[PDB]
Design a protein around this ligand. Structure first.
Ligand SMILES: Nc1ncnc2c1ncn2[C@@H]1O[C@H](COP(=O)(O)OP(=O)(O)OP(=O)(O)O)[C@@H](O)[C@H]1O
Ligand SMILES: Nc1ncnc2c1ncn2[C@@H]1O[C@H](COP(=O)(O)OP(=O)(O)OP(=O)(O)O)[C@@H](O)[C@H]1O
Lengths: 735, 735
């Protein structure tokens, strides 16, 4: 009459040996209600995934409640069963025919154990069950050496009639005390891909964000193992961790890894699936799920799509479910206990849509930022996935990996998986079309397939609120020695002299203004400084912050400034400030005025900042208002205009690297002498049509002639009159 | 007590012989629930299709699940029973009266078997059941000569008293070992239209989109037939395929043909019919159907009208049916398994209504897009439609079909079927009203009826995003030789110099500007490019993109840009920019500014487009954005002014082909010299008005008179002024 509906997996206590494979502690009332012999096989429905983990069953001692059961540590580890997943119970399966090979695998080991074997097979098949997808057994004590070792029995040659039963449990039959079928020791293979078991994600599988990953691991590890120190402190641990960022970064992988690696209680929710039309039933279900959550002392609660389940009160009062469930959740979330052990983490797509009451300092004062992967993160992801499918399928040098990673600038791990999948699919289809069903191993993976995948992938993440501009070394950029010394000085002052600035009292001017021709000295200088400094740098455009909605630009500027503070002491930079700055001559809407006032308050409004230094670049000198041109802010000015000879030589030799200089015969000096009146963008375009004039003559060319350079020099006018030079000079002298 | 409602169909396994006609695996409880003899006939409700498929029934072995049923591949083929349709149970009907003919048809072959017949009557009539619409049996082994044949028993002359049953099942009676009347083998007729049984759609039913249907078949067959290679790769092969295009292109028949071309299980939905007033009922049904589809390895999932089921999250937050179903379906789609053998098919008319999060590259990056068929595809579909009922019903020359296809430019396959139906009904009514119920075989189908139906169809809205201009070749366009050289160089550079650009790093300027009079050389050039280059051509009109709705134009621009990018690297042309460029004057709305900044960011902003080429045509270059024309981008400029003497002479020669030049006596050069200030548009206009004046004198004429030409010329002003030419020249000087 009990009619059980859901079951929860539980750890096996007391260790020892016991059954260890077929514990199955279910109350006898459930067994009687299912008209199934207790001394027979059991089932693990776990919602779908046919095979149902046919394992033998036993009985409890009236000490395990019907709501929670156990299904053996090794079985749940092999099946990737998280501790506390939803479970059902159905009719058992018929007996298997026989077992064929049962071959050891020796996972995470180099094998060659010789005397350390001491008849492993006796312990392997001395226990009932032993399912073929694997079995993890601790080493316990094995002569001198201690240590630990794992075994894998995936490889076999047993065929079962029902194709749906992918688990196809195998029986055990050995003769011994304390002849098999053609021995058991045969090579040290890992889990086979013929059955394609679900690979359990490990620590090495995730990475690329070690700075945040280690912090999250510590923040979830120190309360779950050492609560006595926090209780003695009296401040109580924070019970909530908030995760947010661009979609596709894979925030669920971290929680999945820390759930499958840890042996504590793990439960997950589908979001609004529990929520129904009724209110009392949903409230009762919530109380029941939290009751089952905290009834076990070690537990971790995972919530998905908090923004959807907790809509903002002010944003939209749509109806149905609203902020009263949010309030009751907050009330029950403020009072678990003084010490406590249950820790709940939160992952959301966007933070603004989430109710600000949720992320109060008393509950979520720690913030985890998961941004778009950087170049190093892309290196790590490519390397880890290459190591994941090994070099057997294909081999590729590190040069191609670094080139394809340098091509990627705003790509994400989801995008990288899309590229690899499309490359594999294109390789398969090309092989089928051309080679007429040739062996797939020989075809492998080549660079042109990856290039084609890059061409036709068309990712849906072209618009990003945060831009990670690719980094370039100092060789590409050609600058001036005084300019380089100044840039290095103003990037080394706030990061090294901050310790002595306390006793000095000067701190930093924190004001940098950049003005010059639009040809160059606007983005490459920032790229070089970011590359050399090694600090996190973000790029934001002028028109990008502007939006049709009134107040949207204010939220964007406030949130990017908040990210600037949250991303450690670094350097912030604006691509073009000549849009919001004009307010009187350029008229414009009041949104520009509000943004200007907000940024003025943020930089010099009854506050002070020692970590971040604002850098502004403008196209015109006179477009800035008099409010910005005030002593104490942006006092320093850099000419960064018509650079001297050595910068031109550097940029010309960088652009001429592809071409041959010795064969041309030019000394690379007269070109710079005649080009001294040009700018970077027009120099780049000029060398472009010079190459074009070289190429269309007789198609492919590896040599460029002087006549082509002479023709291209007069093709484009200088486009520069000394009016702007005089204006820049008169703007410089008045400062 | 269980009260079953709906059943499912499954193939009979183990092959062999068994029964092959009346398996009907039914559990004993259902047998007792029908209060009828188990050794008697049963029925298949199949939600309609009166007759209810009266077939004999038997029992299962308690292993076969009660929910599903098996009713033999012959009956599935005869009744078009898709693998997974709803099924209903009902009491048996009246006993079969008698059998009359049972004659073999032997379709898809030339018949004339004789030698290897070996008494087919024995095999056909030794099986219990045998329903008269037809028996489909595999060849198995027939002496030496392997291969396979198909037999159809659609022809018969038996009538049953109840007209509700359209199947009128019969019995078998024969004498032999290892009596009917008038033998069995007779004639070679195809499927009879008297009963008009539904026919199974095949690959030959759809044509003209071979490159699309083959790609779809591959994308549904390699991931399903051989998942072992993908499992070995371990790249999580995609499970879903998206079908998109304009309404009426005929995607539903593609889904039906791919569903019935394979014996695997298929799920079919009826749109929002699954939605119920209970919030939990919908999600419960979704998880139930997902689980039942997953626990059978061979399965295909069909999604119809995802736009209605899944609306935009950020656009329509109506309530109840919201993104919660999207979240739960994504959760189900995430981790059902590793290898799998199930694929999902999703089709919708409007990709815009699809939620942006649902359009992601992580595991749904692959796209299958079908557009408006061209003249070749239309001709192929028309000739296939004619061949469907062959020359017996109607006769038409291939030139008539080609002319009809040429006339059809923007039509769709649904419109083509409407044209065919209109022609048929117009012919029927005309023959009836003309000859007082004469036989329909005399009139047949003529080109006049097709033309009348084409005139009377009156298409509602022939507006699309992929405009298909009429094909125009080289001789139809007259222009200067310099422009021809420039266009040849511009089309030759990308395709035959991409490798050189990659080696040199120059890439391409990807900027083409066309400024000139709006008469000619603006759309005629695009029409010429549409055919002479051989590359896919796209034309977007300025007034067309503008609309009353705010933001719809932006969405259309985004959609067309991503479609052009994803389709293939090709030259894209935009017709007229005068409706959006003048934003600095007249107080233009913010939408135009957003469009301009979006195109500026997507053309040359933190990314490059090495495949496609940006081509823009303008009338007034002074109204373009100041921040749009900069050195290094869109640098190429074409004068493309008024046509010269040669171009005007070519236009006159092309337009004069209708009349006779010898009779008129004009040299086709003096008129061009006199008409020097007229661009191509008003040149063809004056030619048309001269022809009008020529034909108003004595109706049809064979030549144009000089007096008529001079009267037409003197009645229309030149419309040109030296000031605009001087302005164009001085603007070209600065470029
Ligand atoms: N670090 C990574 N390594 C490998 N693949 C990754 C990584 N991060 C993301 N992916 C790929 O992106 C896909 C989607 O990522 P995932 O579902 O974990 O992200 P999410 O942001 O939590 O999800 P959602 O898009 O539903 O919000 C994964 O299935 C995987 O293919
Ligand atoms: N290519 C074609 N060849 C022949 N008949 C066609 C073709 N395209 C459409 N038709 C006709 O038009 C009808 C409409 O097509 P159907 O009902 O299959 O919808 P669909 O076009 O796939 O759907 P939707 O309107 O959602 O795009 C077909 O039943 C058929 O009679």
């Amino acid at each position: 009459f009990k009619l059980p509906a859901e079951f929860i997996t539980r750890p096996h206590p007391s260790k020892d040996h016991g059954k260890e494979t077929c514990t199955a502690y279910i109350h006898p009332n459930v067994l009687s209600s299912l008209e199934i012999n207790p001394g027979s096989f059991c089932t693990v429905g776990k919602i779908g995934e046919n095979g149902i983990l046919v394992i033998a069953r036993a009985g409890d001692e009236e000490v395990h409640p019907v709501n929670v059961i156990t299904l053996s540590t090794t079985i749940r580890s092999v099946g990737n069963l998280i501790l506390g997943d939803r479970l059902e119970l159905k009719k058992a399966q018929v007996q298997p025919p026989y077992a064929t090979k049962v071959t050891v695998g020796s996972l995470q080991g180099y094998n060659i154990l010789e005397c350390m074997e001491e008849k492993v097979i006796q312990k392997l098949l001395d226990d009932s069950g032993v399912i073929m997808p694997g079995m993890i057994f601790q080493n316990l004590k094995t002569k001198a050496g201690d240590e630990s070792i794992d075994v894998v029995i995936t490889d076999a040659s047993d065929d079962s009639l029902p194709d749906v039963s992918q688990l196809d449990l195998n029986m055990d039959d050995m003769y011994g005390g304390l002849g098999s079928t053609h021995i058991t020791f045969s090579k040290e293979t890992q889990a086979n891909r013929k059955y394609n078991l679900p690979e359990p994600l490990s620590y090495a599988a995730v990475g690329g964000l070690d700075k945040e990953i280690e912090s999250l691991k510590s923040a979830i590890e120190i309360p779950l193992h050492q609560p006595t120190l926090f209780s003695s402190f009296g401040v109580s641990p924070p019970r909530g961790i908030l995760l947010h960022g661009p979609p596709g970064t894979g925030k669920t992988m971290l929680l999945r890894v820390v759930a499958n690696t840890s042996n504590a209680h793990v439960l997950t929710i589908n979001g609004p699936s529990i929520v129904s039309k009724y209110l009392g039933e949903t409230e009762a279900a919530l109380r029941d799920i939290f009751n089952e959550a905290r009834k076990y002392q070690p537990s971790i609660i995972f919530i998905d799509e908090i923004d959807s389940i907790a809509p903002n009160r002010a944003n939209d009062d749509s109806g149905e479910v609203e902020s009263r469930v949010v309030a009751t959740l907050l009330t029950l979330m403020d009072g678990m206990g003084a010490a406590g052990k249950v820790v709940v983490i939160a992952a959301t797509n966007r933070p603004n849509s989430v109710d600000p009451a949720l992320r109060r300092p008393g509950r979520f004062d720690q913030e985890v930022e998961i941004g778009i992967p950087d170049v190093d993160a892309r290196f790590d992801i490519l390397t880890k996935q290459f190591s994941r499918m090994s070099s057997d399928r294909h081999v590729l040098d590190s040069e191609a990996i670094k080139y394809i990673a340098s091509k990627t600038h705003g790509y994400v791990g989801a995008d990288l998986t899309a590229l690899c999948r499309e490359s594999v699919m294109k390789t398969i289809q090309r092989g089928l079309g051309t080679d007429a069903n040739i062996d797939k191993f020989s075809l492998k993976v080549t660079l042109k397939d990856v290039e084609s995948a890059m061409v036709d992938i068309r990712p849906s993440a072209m618009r990003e609120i945060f831009l990670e501009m690719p980094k370039v070394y100092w060789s590409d950029i050609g600058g001036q020695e005084e300019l380089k010394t100044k840039m290095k000085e103003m990037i080394q002052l706030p990061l090294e002299a901050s310790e002595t600035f306390a006793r000095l009292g000067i701190s930093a001017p924190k004001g940098v203004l950049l003005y010059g021709p639009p040809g160059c000295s606007k983005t490459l200088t920032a790229k070089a400084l970011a590359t050399e400094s090694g600090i996190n740098f973000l790029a934001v455009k002028g028109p990008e912050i502007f939006n049709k909605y009134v107040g949207e630009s204010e939220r964007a500027i406030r949130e990017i400034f908040r990210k600037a503070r949250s991303a450690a002491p670094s350097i912030i930079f604006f691509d073009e400030i000549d849009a919001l700055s004009p307010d009187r001559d350029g008229s414009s809407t009041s949104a520009a005025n509000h943004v200007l006032t907000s940024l003025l308050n943020e930089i010099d409004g009854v506050e002070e900042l020692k970590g971040v230094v604002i850098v502004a670049a403008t196209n015109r000198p006179d477009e800035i208002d008099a409010a910005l041109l005030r002593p104490g802010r942006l006092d320093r000015h850099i000419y960064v205009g018509p650079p001297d000879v050595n910068a031109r030589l550097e940029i010309l030799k960088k652009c001429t690297k592809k071409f041959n200089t010795e064969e041309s015969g030019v000394d690379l000096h007269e070109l710079a002498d005649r080009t001294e009146g040009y700018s970077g963008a027009e120099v780049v375009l000029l060398c472009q049509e010079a190459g074009l004039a070289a190429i269309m003559e007789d198609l492919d060319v590896a040599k460029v002639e002087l006549r082509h350079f002479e023709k291209a020099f007069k093709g484009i006018a200088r486009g520069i009159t000394p009016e702007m030079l005089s204006y820049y000079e008169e703007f410089a002298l008045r400062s």
